[PDB]
Design a protein around this ligand. Structure first.
Ligand SMILES: *C(=O)[C@@H]([C@@H]1NC(C(=O)O)=C(S[C@@H]2CN[C@@H](C(=O)N(C)C)C2)[C@@H]1C)[C@@H](C)O
Ligand SMILES: *C(=O)[C@@H]([C@@H]1NC(C(=O)O)=C(S[C@@H]2CN[C@@H](C(=O)N(C)C)C2)[C@@H]1C)[C@@H](C)O
Lengths: 247, 247
């Protein structure tokens, strides 16, 4: 990757009082821009952004049968009422259905999971702490620049998985469609943590706009869920200002 | 297929004085509804809806290299200024760029084109009238019911083409995304014909909403370009009233 620190976006962060980073790459990870070089490479819990590799792994191992898979609710009281119904793959991704991806991880298992994270060069690749908890509460960490490299590889069909599985997950990540562009994205929020050691909120993805592609990763410190809306609005304003999406 | 004629949508057509048909199927073509059974099976020129099979055929023959193929603008005047730029596959479909699709048809050739439309069971499979004009001015015709059957095969990956190429075209047809659904669609419009021999406007697609799928095909007589907006608003109004899309 090739990254250059910026000052143009700082006011989008200091107007809202946020400590975080945005990484934005035009065409490829050979042209990235960021407001904060050091934080662009610091690794944080992926939280629900780990549903992107885990759905790819779920498909590649056969645990997710194909793009038509339905994830059927068993009837076990779920932590969220939005999790209490049958979901499609896109649906389980959208509402970050925790029990759905916990079951995928247990069916995948430790060995295969370790193997696919090494092939994908995903973060510190540390999955200790429990096979169905490592991305939520365990030791896995990944940086904003590594997220971008991972998304670009998915975008190019370069991950070690069939092209068909990569295409299935990219379609499942569409979140905004317009005549000139498609936005593929995924949020994450690790929780509030403390005020002294805050959690992290994320928003990573890519925009295909005409013949161009823009990759992006955003993360921020968050100690109050009421600050959750800035995880999308800061990056959205930045991208709207570069003429990438409508915002 | 299995289709039931209905009267609860006729008000949408009569209020705008349009003569047309809407075919809407839930889950599969075994469960279709329509306002007009007879017109639902009548065959019309496909016009730009023909970009769907044409994109799949271009990919399958290798004329279109992969999903990142760019269709470069040579700088010479085109019939519409929206076609006057380099275009991605989604971009070329969205603006139904004629010259891009004429060039694709010329490289696929008559023989392969006939073979694939026999494989796809696409309408009357008559490609006479010029290898680059048949779907716009030639003898090719296809009904609303046949469009639904074809889209359902594409949805299930049952067309005789790789799953990867079918998946690429499904994602290029995405036109609306919302947390609970994606809409995949494609417009069509043959020309105004006459007051007595009207042209035809289309809107075909499918909606993935949660774990459900709804396929749709809408066509109407049109003798004036100003009536073109109805081709999306009648069907949108009908789907919104059934609770499928949020409008
Ligand atoms: C994954 O990160 C967790 C998951 N992801 C997020 C996300 O939007 O980043 C949610 S946020 C949570 C539900 N709605 C939020 C709200 O109250 N706001 C103020 C917007 C709180 C969810 C926590 C996955 C492990 O559950
Ligand atoms: C293909 O059917 C013709 C093509 N399709 C359409 C269509 O939308 O039905 C268009 S005309 C319509 C108004 N002009 C277009 C544009 O303004 N949009 C991008 C909204 C849409 C065109 C006639 C094809 C052969 O070109």
């Amino acid at each position: 990757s090739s990254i250059t620190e910026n000052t143009s976006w700082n006011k989008e962060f200091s107007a809202e009082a946020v400590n975080g980073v945005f990484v934005l790459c035009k065409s490829s990870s050979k042209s990235c821009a960021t407001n904060n070089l050091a934080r662009a490479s610091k690794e944080y819990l992926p939280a629900s952004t780990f549903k992107i590799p885990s759905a790819i792994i779920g498909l590649e191992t056969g645990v997710i049968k194909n793009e038509h898979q339905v994830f059927k609710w068993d009837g076990k009281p779920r932590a969220m009422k939005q999790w209490e119904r049958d979901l499609s793959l896109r649906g389980a991704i959208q509402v970050s259905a925790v029990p759905v991806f916990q079951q995928i991880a247990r069916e995948v298992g430790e060995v295969r999971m370790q193997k696919y994270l090494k092939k994908f060069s995903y973060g510190n690749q540390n999955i200790s702490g429990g096979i169905d908890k490592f991305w939520l509460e365990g030791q896995l960490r990944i940086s904003a620049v590594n997220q971008v490299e991972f998304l670009e590889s998915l975008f190019l069909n370069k991950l070690s998985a069939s092209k068909e599985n990569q295409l299935i997950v990219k379609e499942a990540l569409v979140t905004e469609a317009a005549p000139e562009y498609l936005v593929h994205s995924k949020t994450g929020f690790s929780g509030v943590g403390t005020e002294s050691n805050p959690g992290v909120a994320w928003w990573v993805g890519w925009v295909e706009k005409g013949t161009e592609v823009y990759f992006f990763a955003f993360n921020m410190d968050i100690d109050n869920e009421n600050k959750l809306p800035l995880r999308k609005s800061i990056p959205t304003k930045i991208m709207a200002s570069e003429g990438i999406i409508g915002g």
